[PDB]
Amino acid sequence: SGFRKMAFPSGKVEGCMVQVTCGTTTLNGLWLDDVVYCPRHVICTSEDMLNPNYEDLLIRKSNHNFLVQAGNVQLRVIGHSMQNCVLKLKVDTANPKTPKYKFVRIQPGQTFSVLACYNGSPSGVYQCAMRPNFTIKGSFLNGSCGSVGFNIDYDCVSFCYMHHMELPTGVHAGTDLEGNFYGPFVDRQTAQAAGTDTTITVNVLAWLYAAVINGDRWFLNRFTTTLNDFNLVAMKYNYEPLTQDHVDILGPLSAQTGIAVLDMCASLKELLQNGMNGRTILGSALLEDEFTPFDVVRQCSGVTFQ
């Protein structure tokens, strides 16, 4: 048993991280087949980052301006292309460690693992969730750009995120692997604010189910509620509205625990109105919303604890 914020094994992603240097700017790149993907602001310097015209800056560079290092091996850039906010550097060598992969754009409320890299060398891995305002609460320092977020379906790496910048509130923003930003953010050092964040309700309910599968049942109650009366309380507490599709997604967890979804919503309503009164759920004193129903099933279905 037990429940932890679990990241996917990073071995298949570690073999694709490279270091991309353009002038004095150095960041991480994703080496898949004979293409290296990296944030396009590697072509900028300190005087450019306020408001750079990236097409102007890119046309002033050629293939020899990009130094790509894969460990101690240097890759020759034989072609370059800008795809929205990411650079696509064609190199002379196909990555022999290239796993089967896909480029997917995830939804708010979904999770993924982050491999934080510095100078093409991975240093840590952790799980992240895309907030409803298209930000993530990660851990990124200088030189961490090019770090990728990913999920592993079976043997196929689903790349979904590339890190680009940090907002003034401490949250982080980036793009998918096609260069399209998550949210209304742009890769320039101007005053940018994320939208008002909300709590992912379906994730909280799945996390409550994980507590019951692990034997934390003090929050359960005899009450039940309608979906509309729950959504009325969810709005007051800045929770996303619960849909009928969310209830269907929580179906497998509802059957394994024997607790109806609307019964669990009545427990969440009491937790929202009353609080926890000093108690904890799965070792946490607040309601967690960074666990998807998939994350719970993958960690808790081999348990009963009836």
Binding site: N142, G143, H164, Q189, T190, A191, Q192
Partner: peptide, 5 residues
């Protein structure tokens, strides 16, 4: 305010 990585 936003800082590029």
């Amino acid at each position: 305010x936003a800082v590029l990585x």
